[PDB]
């Protein structure tokens, strides 16, 4: 949920689902 971590999520995981799951937490 924090911009830092979710940015890193969308950055590291370009995969829609992996990104969803990471951003889910971040």
Measured between alpha carbons, how far is residue 11 from residues 17, 26 in Å?
13, 12
The SS3 of residue 14 is coil
Distance from the first to the final alpha carbon of the chain: 4
| Cβ-Cβ contacts under 8 Å for 16 (sequence gap 6 or more) | none
Structural domain total, the chain: 1
| The two three-digit tokens of residue 22, written as one number | 């990471």
**Structural domain for 18, as ranges:** 1-26
Give the integer Cα–Cα distance in Å for 7 and 12: 8
SS3 15: coil
CB neighbours of 24 closer than 8 A, spacing ≥ 6?
A: none
């Amino acid at each position: 949920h924090d911009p830092e971590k979710r940015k890193e999520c969308e950055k590291k995981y370009t995969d829609p689902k992996k990104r969803e799951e990471c951003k889910r937490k971040a």
